[PDB]
């Protein structure tokens, strides 16, 4: 049967991913796919589920799924988790404390890195305050650290808030690109369906 299979292809197998500061969100519903093959896959170096069981995922049903995808550094995968602090968790992508879903990551050094450097994926380094869960910031306003307004002038305390991930084939795993897919599962009680 294939009345409506889950279009995880457009997310996991996407030809290009977003930068973490501008992470994408895909809404998934209607369908019905299996997560055993996902969890039993030898390609996902990270597969962490919170409040839910990855292999008992086939037994459960929900209302909605949010498929958040982006690219970060290797040693930043640990931030994609509830209750984390750091450059990514504070300024790029924040998971709530009551997060219900799975965090999936895999090494993408074969795709998102080229000789000389893949200086395309970006991240937010400066922000006046931390992000609320699932908040997205794409502003390029010159960050102000002094009392004087920057007014579009890159002066003393006035710098750009974004920087470039530079990925090369010889870099270490902690600095190699990793594509992340965050699946958020919604609420449901007494699944008789």
């Amino acid at each position, epitope marked *: 049967h294939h009345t409506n299979l889950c279009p995880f292809g457009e997310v996991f197998n996407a030809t*290009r991913f*977003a*930068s*973490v*500061y*501008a*992470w*994408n969100r895909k809404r998934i519903s209607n369908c019905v796919a299996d997560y055993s093959v996902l969890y039993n896959s030898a390609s996902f170096s990270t597969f962490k589920c919170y409040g839910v069981s990855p292999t008992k995922l086939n037994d459960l049903c929900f209302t909605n799924v949010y498929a958040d995808s*982006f690219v970060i550094r290797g040693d930043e995968v640990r931030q994609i988790a509830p209750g984390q602090t750091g450059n990514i968790a504070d300024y790029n992508y924040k998971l709530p404390d009551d997060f219900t879903g799975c965090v999936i990551a895999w090494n993408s050094n074969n795709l998102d890195s*080229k*000789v*000389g*450097g*893949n*200086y*395309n*994926y*970006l991240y937010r380094l400066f922000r006046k305050s931390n992000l609320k869960p699932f908040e997205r910031d*794409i502003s*390029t306003e010159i960050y102000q650290a002094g009392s004087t307004p920057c007014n579009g002038v*890159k002066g003393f305390n006035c710098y*750009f808030p*974004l*920087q*470039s991930y*530079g990925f090369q084939p010889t870099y270490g795993v902690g600095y190699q690109p990793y594509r992340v897919v965050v699946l958020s599962f919604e609420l449901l009680h007494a699944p008789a369906t």
Partner: antibody, heavy 128, light 111 residues
């Protein structure tokens, strides 16, 4: 208006290397990328590579990937482009231009979106 | 082996309108902007259009760009003698991770 003065013409032997300079103009690096484009005699334009100082970033064009180097000394405020293992087909006028940057926030990327101010170009000849 | 394509030549009666076509794919114009350059023989190219159809200072409104899906077009209204030049379209293709220039279109004014 700003001006990008590149180094003078060059004549090289196959196998050697050439390094072209391109002086910037004041605080050009602030919110302005720089691309290196060459044009063979009677042929079209060919992007070779670029750099973004504010993001401390740079990229290259597939054709020249593995035989090119693009540097940017921000103290002097200028860029360089070094092409090694030169061949006769590398004979072209090498241009340097400032690129106005576009922000595609949908995918979180920052690429060049047109180059308004151009350099005067550098003629490089390669013959055995 | 290039992706972007332009017609080699183009003709237009003076004072009238011309269209220069630019054909691309999903990897460049599918999600990246396309700009236009004008180059006079012997001189250096100059920016004509930059965000599909934005005009820099010094470019008259006689030039207008347009983009729909994988194709782009440049229109020159009221052809003048100084408009006879090479016209290149270009877009940031990500498959090769870099800008790709068109083959160029030589314009000939029939006056």
């Amino acid at each position: 208006e700003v001006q990008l003065v590149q180094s003078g013409a060059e004549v090289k032997k196959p196998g050697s290397s050439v390094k072209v300079s391109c002086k910037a103009s004041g605080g050009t690096f602030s919110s302005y990328g720089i691309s290196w484009v060459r044009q063979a005699p009677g042929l079209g334009l060919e992007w070779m590579g670029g750099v973004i100082p504010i993001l401390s970033a740079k990229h290259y064009a597939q054709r020249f990937q593995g035989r090119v180097t693009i540097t940017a000394d921000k103290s002097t405020g200028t860029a360089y482009m070094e092409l090694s293992s030169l061949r006769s087909e590398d004979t072209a006028v090498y241009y340097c231009a400032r690129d106005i940057l576009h922000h595609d926030d949908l995918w979180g990327r920052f690429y060049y979106d047109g180059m308004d101010v151009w350099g005067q170009g550098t003629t490089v000849t390669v013959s055995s | 082996q290039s992706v972007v394509t332009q017609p080699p030549s183009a003709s237009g009666t003076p004072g009238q309108r011309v269209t220069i076509s630019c054909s691309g794919s999903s990897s460049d114009i599918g999600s990246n902007t396309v700009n236009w350059y004008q180059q006079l023989p012997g001189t250096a190219p100059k920016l004509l259009i930059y965000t599909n159809n934005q005009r820099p200072s010094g470019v008259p409104d006689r030039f207008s760009g347009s983009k729909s899906g994988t194709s782009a077009s440049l229109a020159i209204t009221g052809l003048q003698s100084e408009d006879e030049a090479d016209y290149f379209c270009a877009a940031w293709d990500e498959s090769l991770n870099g800008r790709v220039f068109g083959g160029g279109t030589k314009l000939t004014v029939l006056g």
